[PDB]
């Protein structure tokens, strides 16, 4: 509703264009940047392939808008993981491929597993006097 008769471009504080009104149709659009980002690749010297993490992307978005691949995939907490088996039920006390938030990539194929470096010592003695 903000475009007056002499106005056709919406700018931010930095001087990027972020919206416009089309001179022919008078339709109004917001402009958003196309997605840009890195791939976090985990590699082990004893392996022939990478485990790939697309941080904060759901696998449907990666496959539809970035690239199709033949590799198996799943939606982990950190984002879409390719070429690793979802085994967060399993746990490891040491990890060379630390992904964040207590998740680790382990290699035998790759596994995506939880990192739990410390334990409590347990005894079966009574708590009560």
């Amino acid at each position: 509703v903000y475009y007056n008769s002499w106005q056709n471009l919406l700018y931010d504080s930095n001087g990027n264009i972020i919206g416009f009104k089309d001179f022919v149709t008078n339709k109004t659009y917001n402009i958003f940047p196309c997605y840009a980002g890195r791939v976090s690749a985990a590699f082990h010297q004893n392996a022939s392939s990478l485990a790939l993490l697309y941080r904060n992307l759901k696998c449907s978005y990666v496959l539809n808008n970035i690239s199709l691949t033949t590799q198996p995939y799943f939606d982990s907490y950190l984002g879409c993981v390719f070429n690793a088996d979802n085994l967060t039920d399993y746990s490891v006390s040491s990890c060379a491929l630390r992904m964040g938030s207590g998740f680790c990539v382990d290699y035998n194929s790759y596994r995506f597993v939880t990192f739990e470096p410390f334990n409590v010592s347990f005894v079966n003695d009574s708590i009560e006097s």
Binding site: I18, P33, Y35, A36, G37, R38, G100, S101, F115
Partner: peptide, 27 residues
Amino acid sequence: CTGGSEIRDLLCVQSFNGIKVLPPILS
């Protein structure tokens, strides 16, 4: 950042310009 929201979060603009905060190794 890929949710299509009309809200222009500066964290998304930073990440698309290659500036990002990773999670710590222990949650």
